[PDB]
Enzyme design. Structure first.
Site, short mmCIF file in Angstrom:
data_model
loop_
_atom_site.label_atom_id
_atom_site.label_comp_id
_atom_site.label_asym_id
_atom_site.label_seq_id
_atom_site.Cartn_x
_atom_site.Cartn_y
_atom_site.Cartn_z
N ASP A 35 20.69 -15.62 11.70
CA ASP A 35 19.68 -15.20 10.54
C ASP A 35 20.31 -14.31 10.03
O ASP A 35 20.25 -13.05 10.07
CB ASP A 35 18.44 -14.98 11.42
CG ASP A 35 17.34 -14.67 10.29
OD1 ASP A 35 17.63 -14.99 9.19
OD2 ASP A 35 16.44 -14.04 10.65
N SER A 199 21.56 -14.43 -9.37
CA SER A 199 22.16 -15.86 -9.56
C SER A 199 22.02 -15.98 -11.07
O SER A 199 21.20 -14.88 -11.79
CB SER A 199 21.26 -17.02 -9.07
OG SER A 199 21.46 -18.25 -9.74
#
Length: 330
Positions: A35, A199
């Site tokens: 994770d 992004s």
């Protein structure tokens, strides 16, 4: 040193991935959910409330000659999906794919919430975010990667998740045969403890690319892709009959649909998520309403590049003094 381990989807939807991990002496092998959105290595154990164990493999520290109680240490964690777990702490030897750390904090669950009990395939979590998020008190503990880093050939790990197929976690090296083209690296902020990056934009299907900054986290422990409501609305508007359902808890679409791809920007590069990766199947057994793999982050407080996005790429978690993330097509 290096390590290399295969990671396998837990079910036919790629809801999560499990990777075998050796704990203790002699080794006890548990299948953990790696994770990158959390920083605790915790396991089902001989200390877990019996009624909360249903098929998981447990760690029994009393059977490990290298286990030592970390005296006074406790842990308690809550995840973004509302699940939780807590317990006490041992140190022991932990190996992943041939890479061994001695003295790793292994957090033994005394209590787990229902969603953990109900998932017999996940024996615990191995956190790979930054150690500043580790929940052990009163002495915060380091992640497996943080402890291994100095011994690794290169201070990196990579995630290569499969679509409906096994993939690989590598530690300490970049497998140049595992991706196509070049890797594009992008800046990371560690201020919230996550692999947080920005992004450069998105496209829906064959549509034109929209240049826009989207701050979010690379999170192997989250199944879906959570993005701003504007972006998610633009995606689902291209799917006939798709709608946001308050009763289901997100966007659903007709199972008869063919979904468009979704592209996200990494610097000047582009990662394409095929439409099929966005199909999470019937909302309930036999339903013709299907659950979408791209959902709004509006209620979360952060955008999450979960498995739907990450499995379309070869992803480098670069833990150099200034951390960065790399993405390549594959």
């Amino acid at each position: 040193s290096t390590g290399s381990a295969t990671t396998t989807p837990i079910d036919s939807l790629d809801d999560a991935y499990i990777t075998p991990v050796q704990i203790g002496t002699p080794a006890q092998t548990l299948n953990l959910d790696f994770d990158t959105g959390s920083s605790d290595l915790w396991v089902f154990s001989s200390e877990t409330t019996a009624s909360e164990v249903d098929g998981q493999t447990i760690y029994t520290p009393s059977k490990s000659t290298t286990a030592k109680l970390l005296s006074g240490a406790t842990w308690s964690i809550s995840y973004g999906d509302g699940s939780s777990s807590s317990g006490d702490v041992y140190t022991d030897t932990v190996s992943v794919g041939g890479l061994t750390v001695t003295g790793q904090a292994v957090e033994s669950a005394k209590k787990v919430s229902s969603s953990f009990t109900e998932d017999s395939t996940i024996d615990g979590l191995l956190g790979l975010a930054f150690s500043t998020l580790n929940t052990v008190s009163p002495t915060q503990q380091k992640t497996f990667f943080d402890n291994a880093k100095a011994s690794l050939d290169s201070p990196v790990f990579t995630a290569d998740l499969g679509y409906h197929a096994p993939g690989t976690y590598n530690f300490g090296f970049i497998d140049t045969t595992a991706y196509t083209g070049s890797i594009t690296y992008t800046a990371v902020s560690t201020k919230q403890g996550f692999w947080e990056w920005t992004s450069t934009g998105y496209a829906v299907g064959s549509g034109t690319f929209k240049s826009t900054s989207i701050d979010g986290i690379a999170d192997t422990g989250t199944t879906l892709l959570y993005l701003p409501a504007t972006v998610v609305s633009a995606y689902w508007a291209q799917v006939s009959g798709a709608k946001s359902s308050s009763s289901v808890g997100g966007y659903v679409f007709p199972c008869s649909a063919t979904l468009p791809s979704f592209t996200f920007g990494v610097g000047s590069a582009r990662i394409v998520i095929p439409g099929d990766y966005i199909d999470f199947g019937p909302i309930s057994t036999g339903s013709s309403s299907c659950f979408g793999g791209i959902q709004s982050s509006a209620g979360i407080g952060i955008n999450i590049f979960g498995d739907v996005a990450l499995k379309a790429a070869f992803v480098v978690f670069n833990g150099a003094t200034t951390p960065t993330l790399g993405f390549a097509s594959k």
